[PDB]
Design a protein around this ligand. Structure first.
Ligand SMILES: CCCCCCCCCCCCCCCCCC(=O)OC[C@H](COP(=O)(O)OC[C@H](O)CO)OC(=O)CCCCCCCCCCCCCCC
Ligand SMILES: CCCCCCCCCCCCCCCCCC(=O)OC[C@H](COP(=O)(O)OC[C@H](O)CO)OC(=O)CCCCCCCCCCCCCCC
Ligand SMILES: CCCCCCCCCCCCCCCCCC(=O)OC[C@H](COP(=O)(O)OC[C@H](O)CO)OC(=O)CCCCCCCCCCCCCCC
Ligand SMILES: CCCCCCCCCCCCCCCCCC(=O)OC[C@H](COP(=O)(O)OC[C@H](O)CO)OC(=O)CCCCCCCCCCCCCCC
Ligand SMILES: CC(C)=CCC/C(C)=C/CC/C(C)=C/CC/C(C)=C/CC/C(C)=C/CC/C(C)=C/CC/C(C)=C/CC1=C(C)C(=O)c2ccccc2C1=O
Ligand SMILES: *SC1=C(S)[C@@H]2Nc3c(nc(N)[nH]c3=O)N[C@@H]2O[C@@H]1COP(=O)(O)OP(=O)(O)OC[C@H]1O[C@@H](n2cnc3c(=O)[nH]c(N)nc32)[C@H](O)[C@@H]1O
Ligand SMILES: Nc1nc2c(c(=O)[nH]1)N[C@H]1C(S)=C(S)[C@@H](COP(=O)(O)OP(=O)(O)OC[C@H]3O[C@@H](n4cnc5c(=O)[nH]c(N)nc54)[C@H](O)[C@@H]3O)O[C@H]1N2
Ligand SMILES: CCCCCCCCCCCCCC(=O)O
Ligand SMILES: CCCCCCCCCCCCCC(=O)O
Ligand SMILES: CCCCCCCCCCC(=O)O
Ligand SMILES: CCCCCCCCCCC(=O)O
Ligand SMILES: CCCCCCCCCCC(=O)O
Ligand SMILES: CCCCCCCCCCC(=O)O
Ligand code: SF4
Ligand code: SF4
Ligand code: SF4
Ligand code: SF4
Ligand code: SF4
Ligand code: SF4
Ligand code: FES
Ligand SMILES: [Mo+4]
Ligand SMILES: [S]
Lengths: 975, 118, 61, 57, 197
């Protein structure tokens, strides 16, 4: 439809709105410098001038109206594009041969080569501004800035950090952070969008700077004169452009660009990691990345210094006396195998419990569970999901039947309303929050953030309401009652794909709007208006992170949320559904491959005859009928003497579990302990033998992110020292246990698990090549399911069931535990920071843990900033610094987990867990407030991103540039 | 297990580290077996052709070669020749050639017209 | 004799393969003994003449 | 290498190539004989003259 | 392929493998050819350069005469190789049996020499498999077994077959080992099935 003619030849139009998309699909060589597919039309480079309807206009923003005439080889359009690129090069020095970004992907270089230009009519003029190297990760070079606005559009529209603007009013326009604050002192999240989206080397990572190529490591005092020499020597750009292409080929040999998936959080963003030997030069996202595309956070794009950190354990460590001796691989393997055989043939395999890391690949968790069941014969396996996703998955089983998100992050963006409850998506799953904020700022989607704290998203939400600690169930079920009672609920969906509507309504009888108003401490008007919005919203996406699921009734309120969507009728609809925020990069993958003790790989319960018979046939070893014990209850079993040995890999559970005094006592109580961590973590300190893990960069596997996407990794580095990828270590351990495993590369493990797992039936390494990713469930034909519950639910009847649940009383200690401290995670730091702390930049941004305290409570208790304070709970006693901010309200305070010493929050939390899944109630914590030091150094430096003031504007605001008298449009300049 | 932090690094003496690095160099040689064979053949064919012995005479009696070169060159004619070559390069650099391209095109047309006259 | 098809390749470990290839390189050196002597003399005469030290100053500073 | 040298000499031994190399050496010698210190003002004047000539549209 | 003057009809074995500058990719070799077409003015100099490139090939290209193994015509031809792979089978006019004549086998059938299936090591029947054994141990085993069955039931119970695909020296060695060593006369070849009548 919408017939068009381009280049004098008839062509058809597609859903694309602008001429530039059609030209790209038609492979017309139209210069497009300022256009990025994810960014959208920025219209600031004017090199995309084409003749639409005869008039010269920007093809990047020219609407593809029916019947228009398109010409691109005309002398007029060629002259306009040449003038535009000359204006661009007036702002770009263009020293391609000695420029780090000339890895062949630089749009100025490519476009300049494509136009076959040889001269710039306007000579290059250095801007008066100096390079801004304040940031420890990426620098900005206003001399090389071409003012294309891609970085500003990224920071304002696709990442919505809003730290970047452009001072068009200035005599020399440039990119400015906040109000021209230096970069470090500004509100820059350090997400890396500006660096990734920059066409030129204007906004480029300091890792590349002076390290990308061969001639770019030359000192600036002796590189700049060479640049001036070449400027004054070459007459045509063609020859030196060819020389720069040779230098790009130069870089190609030394620069290794391998795809990987970020290990930190469950968004599972995939990107190439441009390295030079062992150091990491750049983290370059690609538009083809499924989970993020170009989107990235500070962790995944500047947090990989832990791989090359000297603290990394290169050799196996054995607990010799009172020290850790650096022992050989073979002797450590023999020791662990002999000890495991001893405690297996003495007290039985049931007294053996092993933990896989949710940070490791699917092959890793599958190998853990196989070693437990197909080798040891026990079922005691778990991961962080016991603390993270056990109640969410339990609720999904109880209502929908499938664990994981209902769809992809693209479906999150496509939603009309996002119901985020207990989620610090801005600081925990950053890229998903960028998608949500992009849809809110641009697509007009309204979101309802419901959490006690006021994070970045809460202050940027359509309706932010803070309920009481764990009181999400009350107001949520009241909202569901109102929706189902006033007729706004989708009754057709209820009759079609839902069961037990009247039973759920009977369960909702005691729940009233005033009841929720009293319980949650929230006014009735906000609840009624958000319920009206939910009823009116066509598509609803409900995200619930640990703020709600990590509670005594966390499973109950997870079922409540899921059946709330069920009543609303969002499952199966494109762009709407339940998206429990999977925390670790592969916590979803670990749970998929039988990490939880009650289920096998394929998300099948262990107490099923058919699956047990199939796993016996494939493995050759009988399956333990007795379900394994939960991770949290393991410590109590140890204190009762039931458990004696642990094999926990890549999980520092001695510091992240509730009441870490209790896990410390259990650790000192148990006999044999083997841990598998890249760094000498807190758990690694208490271990009879330490096995040197390998980070996901140095190992190949498959990461299953929150969107139930299984994306294959690549071996970025050979493992440091002689340490091995965790799958290799597990294979060696099992072989020393008489397993007989033969897996040369993890593809065999992946295909074996695919055969075993009904949900993973179709995932294979040849189907996961490059950036291709499959979202479980996948059938044997290889066709995945991007949206869950699209046609039918997994239940035998094909229709989901509403689960009757009530408000489970939070285990608040009561009495002297007045102040209710809240525990979470910061954006820059990852849990205790076994990885981020090893990166110098993140340490500079956030050096130490802090206790965020409310201004109201700063008056009655008389507390100030930079003060060391004491928090005491029947399970711990921490000494943490203090921070003054309005993010927290009243007594409730925020204590991020970004310290691993005496200041870790996990001392205060107790051994009270959920009824359904025994998930510790980390969010249910209370303590004292003791003032130790009145005057001290503020834990949050001025260079932290929370101290800045972002400028919220939509787009690059080009209209300000167009209002400048000096600016002239090339289309009417050629005239 | 109690709390222990200190790490007892294995005592790799100089002999063991030297053996490991020599093994690494040997493995690198192994990866480039064909390259090493080709370079050894390079040296063999150069030595047979006398190129390597020619350079051996060049660098063994190098003092004599330099003496012969300077004693032959030290004549004022050769010094003047090199000086005037450098001066010619400098002057050709001083001469502006951007305006000289149309002159070259006109000279081309004129030579074509001249040779056109049978 | 019955019908047997599968081949049990000898287990040449990394050490044996490395020794074999190092022996091959040594044999190649042996074939070009005179060439290696000439190249070593090349380096010696260049270093004595200062050409090699001149390049060492060139590439160190 | 013997064959390469043989091909090179048998192609070069033509009187044209020997004359070409001899005349190249002679040209170098004559350009050395020519004094260029006085020729720099001549080059500057030639530059100005070419600029004036191309200035005439 | 053999009779073509130019590289018009030439074996794919030579294609991109004969010389040093001919392995360059066509997308980056054709522009070089056009460059040289537009650069050189006389064919003599670039012809000399091509003669140097022929001398280049002479070192890497081994041209040794052989006789085809397949059938009894015994066509003789040079086998132009580059290391271990076979680039061309070039017949010569001086070949007595064929001259330039050749079939598909003798002129394009020699990939079996470089085939990975080729037995590089002696194999010994160990139990129910073929173990890749050393040369010396296999030689000792065969010698000891042959001595056993020679001094137990006599050489007359020993029968050896030479290949008609092997050289004259090979069959002479078979019959000498049978008669001048073992002492038996039980020797034959495919000729019993082929040329005996
Ligand atoms: C430290 C200091 C380093 C200084 C730079 C050194 C290298 C300069 C570039 C190489 C020489 C360039 C000049 C030249 O040489 O000429 C000038 C003239 C100007 O352009 P014009 O505007 O006059 O014309 C445009 C044309 O029509 C279409 O490009 O041409 C060009 O630069 C064309 C360059 C073509 C590629 C480079 C030369 C290749 C020669 C053959 C190589 C074969 C290898 C096999
Ligand atoms: C793209 C190519 C780039 C190449 C780039 C090549 C770059 C390397 C330089 C090659 C030339 C080295 C100097 C060779 C001359 C000086 C030494 C000499 O005089 O030594 C005598 C000896 C006589 O030999 P004899 O056996 O008779 O005597 C043996 C004993 O002296 C007595 O027992 O000379 C030779 O052996 C010839 C050596 C090779 C000469 C090649 C000349 C042309 C090179 C450029 C064109 C290449 C085109 C390739 C492609 C077509
Ligand atoms: C066909 C031939 C092709 C050749 C092709 C040859 C290709 C290889 C290049 C040769 C020249 C290298 C640079 C030499 C000069 C720079 C180094 C220098 O300055 O080093 C000083 C030193 C002084 O020596 P001293 O002992 O006094 O001082 C010792 C200590 O410095 C103090 O203790 O210089 C020497 O040793 C002289 C080295 C050889 C120079 C040869 C020059 C002519 C080469 C071309 C013509 C060859 C014709 C051969 C055939 C007729
Ligand atoms: C990738 C791109 C590669 C491009 C080709 C590079 C090499 C070009 C050939 C070498 C230069 C040729 C031009 C030249 O140079 O001249 C031109 C003139 C034209 O022919 P004419 O029709 O004018 O005359 C014919 C004669 O009378 C009889 O051939 O001459 C010739 O090509 C004669 C070439 C002679 C051999 C090559 C030069 C040898 C120089 C001495 C070497 C000594 C080593 C010791
Ligand atoms: C007789 C005797 C023995 C004498 C000994 C003493 C003696 C006289 C020795 C000779 C000394 C001399 C003359 C040396 C010069 C030759 C040598 C050896 C050079 C090596 C030194 C180096 C590193 C040179 C630079 C090489 C090189 C490729 C540099 C990169 C060029 C740069 C910086 C380009 C930047 C650049 C610019 C500026 C553009 O405008 C542009 C536009 C469009 C596309 C790309 C570009 C681009 O890349
Ligand atoms: S799980 C998990 C992992 S694994 C991973 N951890 C992580 C992440 N990012 C970074 N930068 N560092 C890390 O260590 N991302 C991943 O996060 C996953 C869990 O993250 P959450 O989004 O659950 O994170 P926090 O605990 O920081 O934020 C939770 C918010 O919940 C609110 N809240 C607290 N108590 C609440 C309550 O009773 N009711 C409600 N409705 N909300 C509550 C607070 O506002 C916290 O900010
Ligand atoms: N108070 C409180 N406590 C909590 C929580 C809370 O909200 N509040 N949250 C709970 C939850 S959800 C979780 S995730 C836990 C976090 O606890 P874990 O899931 O154990 O996470 P981390 O300690 O961040 O990472 C564990 C270790 O993995 C190692 N590692 C990193 N990459 C790899 C790899 O590729 N392979 C291997 N083998 N090891 C690797 C790192 O060195 C690090 O020491 O905290 C839990 N504890
Ligand atoms: C290894 C093979 C080495 C090839 C011969 C080296 C030639 C050395 C040239 C001397 C001139 C110089 O190095 O400056
Ligand atoms: C082996 C003998 C090596 C001879 C000296 C090598 C000179 C190296 C010349 C440096 C210039 C370059 O390689 O580009
Ligand atoms: C030019 C490359 C020289 C590399 C020499 C390596 C010798 C290593 C000898 C050994 O490994 O014992
Ligand atoms: C009567 C005098 C006749 C003079 C002719 C001069 C040459 C004219 C043709 C020039 C050419 O095209 O070669
Ligand atoms: C330049 C040629 C370097 C070849 C070095 C070979 C070293 C082999 C040492 C060994 O065989 O132990
Ligand atoms: C009536 C004769 C007029 C002759 C004009 C010759 C050109 C004069 C201008 C020269 C220039 O500046 O191009
Ligand atoms: S930013 Fe691009 S065009 Fe500019 S110097 Fe670097 S590679 Fe060349
Ligand atoms: S938040 Fe920081 S890294 Fe991300 S786009 Fe803005 S300035 Fe760039
Ligand atoms: S810094 Fe930003 S505005 Fe400047 S050239 Fe780079 S991407 Fe464009
Ligand atoms: S958002 Fe999460 S997965 Fe994506 S780059 Fe950042 S840390 Fe990695
Ligand atoms: S060798 Fe030369 S003349 Fe013969 S076919 Fe090839 S290109 Fe043509
Ligand atoms: S070349 Fe062909 S016809 Fe000649 S002997 Fe070989 S197989 Fe027989
Ligand atoms: S892409 Fe349209 S002006 Fe740059
Ligand atoms: Mo988690
Ligand atoms: S997790």
């Amino acid at each position: 439809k919408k017939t068009i003619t381009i280049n004098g030849v008839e062509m058809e139009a597609s859903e694309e709105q602008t001429v530039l998309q059609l030209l790209n699909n038609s492979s017309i060589e139209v210069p497009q410098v300022c256009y990025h597919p994810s960014l959208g039309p920025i219209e600031t480079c004017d090199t995309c001038i084409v003749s639409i309807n005869g008039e010269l206009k920007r093809s990047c923003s020219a609407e593809l109206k029916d019947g228009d005439v398109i010409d691109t080889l005309s002398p007029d359009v060629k002259k306009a594009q040449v003038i535009g690129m000359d204006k661009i090069l007036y702002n770009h020095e263009l020293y391609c041969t000695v420029c780090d970004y000339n890895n062949g992907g630089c749009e100025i270089h490519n476009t300049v080569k494509e136009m076959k230009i040889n001269h710039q009519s306007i000579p290059f003029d250095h801007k008066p501004y100096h390079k801004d190297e304040s940031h420890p990760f990426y620098r900005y070079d206003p001399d090389q800035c071409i003012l294309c606005g891609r970085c500003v559009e990224a920071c304002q529209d696709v990442q919505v950090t809003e730290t970047l603007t452009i001072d068009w009013e200035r005599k020399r326009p440039r990119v400015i952070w906040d109000n021209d604050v230096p970069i470090n002192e500004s509100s820059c999240v350090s997400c890396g969008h500006c660096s990734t989206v920059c066409p030129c080397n204007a906004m480029m990572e300091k890792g590349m700077e002076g390290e990308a190529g061969y001639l770019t490591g030359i000192n600036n005092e002796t590189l700049r004169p060479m640049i001036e020499i070449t400027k004054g020597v070459e007459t045509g750009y063609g020859s030196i452009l060819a020389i720069s292409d040779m230098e790009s080929a130069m870089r190609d040999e030394r620069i290794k660009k391998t795809k990987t998936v970020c290990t930190y959080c469950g968004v599972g963003c995939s990107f190439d990691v441009w390295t030079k030997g062992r150091d990491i030069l750049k983290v370059e996202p690609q538009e083809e990345a499924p989970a993020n595309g170009i989107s990235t956070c500070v962790k995944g794009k500047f947090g990989w210094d832990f791989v090359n950190s000297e603290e990394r354990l290169t050799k196996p460590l054995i607990r010799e006396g009172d020290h850790f001796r650096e022992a050989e691989w073979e002797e450590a393997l023999l020791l662990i195998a002999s000890k495991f055989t001893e405690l297996k043939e003495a007290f039985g395999p049931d007294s053996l419990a092993f933990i896989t890391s949710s940070k490791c690949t699917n092959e890793e968790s599958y190998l853990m569970q196989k070693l437990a069941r197909g080798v040891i014969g026990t079922n005691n396996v778990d991961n962080c999901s016991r603390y993270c996703q056990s109640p969410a998955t339990a609720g999904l089983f109880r209502t929908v039947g499938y664990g994981g998100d209902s769809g992809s992050i693209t479906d999150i963006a496509q939603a009309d309303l996002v119901l985020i409850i207990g989620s610090n998506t801005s600081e925990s799953h950053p890229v998903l929050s960028t998608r949500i904020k992009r849809a809110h700022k641009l697509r007009g989607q309204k979101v309802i953030v419901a959490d006690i704290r006021k994070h970045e998203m809460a202050e940027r939400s359509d309706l932010f309401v803070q309920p009481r600690a764990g009181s999400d169930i009350v107001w949520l079920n009241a909202i569901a009652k109102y929706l189902i009672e006033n007729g706004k609920a989708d009754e057709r969906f209820l009759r079609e794909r839902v069961n037990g509507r009247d039973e759920y309504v009977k369960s909702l009888a005691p729940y009233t709007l005033e009841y929720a108003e009293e319980k949650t401490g929230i006014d009735q008007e906000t609840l009624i208006q958000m319920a009206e919005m939910i009823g009116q919203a066509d598509s609803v996406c409900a995200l619930w992170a640990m703020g709600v699921t990590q509670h005594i009734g966390g499973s109950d309120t997870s079922t409540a949320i899921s059946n709330l969507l069920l009543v609303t009728g969002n499952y199966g609809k494109p762009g709407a559904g339940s998206y429990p925020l999977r925390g670790h990069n592969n916590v979803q993958g670990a749970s998929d491959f039988g990490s939880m003790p009650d289920r096998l790989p394929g998300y099948e319960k262990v107490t099923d005859e058919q699956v047990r018979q199939k796993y016996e046939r494939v493995w050759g070893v009988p399956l333990p009928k007795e379900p394994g014990m939960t991770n949290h209850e393991m410590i109590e079993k140890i204190h009762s003497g039931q458990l004696k040995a642990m094999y926990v890999k890549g999980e520092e559970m001695g510091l992240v579990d509730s009441n870490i005094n209790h896990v410390h006592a259990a650790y000192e109580k148990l006999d044999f302990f083997v841990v598998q961590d890249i760094f000498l973590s807190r758990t690694a300190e208490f271990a009879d033998v330490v096995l040197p893990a390998s980070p996901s960069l140095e190992k190949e596997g498959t990461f299953t992110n929150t969107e139930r996407r299984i994306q294959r990794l690549y071996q970025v580095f050979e493992p440091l020292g002689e340490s091995k990828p965790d799958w290799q270590i597990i294979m060696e351990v099992a072989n020393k246990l008489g397993a007989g495993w033969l897996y040369e590369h993890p593809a065999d493990i992946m295909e074996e698990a695919a055969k075993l797992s009904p949900i993973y039936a179709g995932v294979t390494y040849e189907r996961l090549e490059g950036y291709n990713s499959l979202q479980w469930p996948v059938n044997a034909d290889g066709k995945d399911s991007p949206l869950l519950f699209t046609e039918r639910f997994p239940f035998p009847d094909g229709k989901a069931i509403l689960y009757p649940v009530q408000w489970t009383e939070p285990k608040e200690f009561g009495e002297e535990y007045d102040i209710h401290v809240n525990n979470g995670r910061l954006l820059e730091h990852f849990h205790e920071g076994n990885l981020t702390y090893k990166s110098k930049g993140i340490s500079e941004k956030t050096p130490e843990v802090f206790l965020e305290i409310s201004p109201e409570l700063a008056a009655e208790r008389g507390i100030q900033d930079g003060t060391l304070v004491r928090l005491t709970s029947p399970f711990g006693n921490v000494k943490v610094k203090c921070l003054i901010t309005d993010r927290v309200k009243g007594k409730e305070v925020y204590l991020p987990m970004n310290d691993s010493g005496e200041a870790a929050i996990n001392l205060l939390t107790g051994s009270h867990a959920d009824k359904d899944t025994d998930t510790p109630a980390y969010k249910e914590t209370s303590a004292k407030m003791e003032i130790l030091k009145h005057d001290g150094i503020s834990p949050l430096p001025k260079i932290n991103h929370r101290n800045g003031n972002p400028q919220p504007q939509i787009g690059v605001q080009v209209h300000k540039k167009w209002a400048r008298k000096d600016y002239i449009f090339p289309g009417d300049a050629v005239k | 297990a109690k709390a222990i932090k200190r790490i007892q690094k294995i005592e790799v003496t100089e002999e063991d580290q030297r053996k490991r690095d020599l093994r690494e160099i040997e493995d690198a040689l192994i990866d480039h077996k064909e390259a090493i064979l080709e370079t050894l053949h390079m040296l063999g064919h150069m030595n047979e052709r006398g190129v390597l012995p020619l350079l051996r005479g060049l660098f063994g009696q190098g003092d004599k070669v330099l003496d012969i070169l300077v004693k032959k060159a030290d004549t004022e004619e050769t010094a003047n020749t090199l000086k005037n070559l450098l001066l010619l390069f400098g002057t050709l650099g001083m001469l502006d050639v951007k305006q000289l391209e149309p002159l070259i095109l006109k000279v081309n047309a004129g030579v074509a017209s001249a040779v056109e006259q049978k």
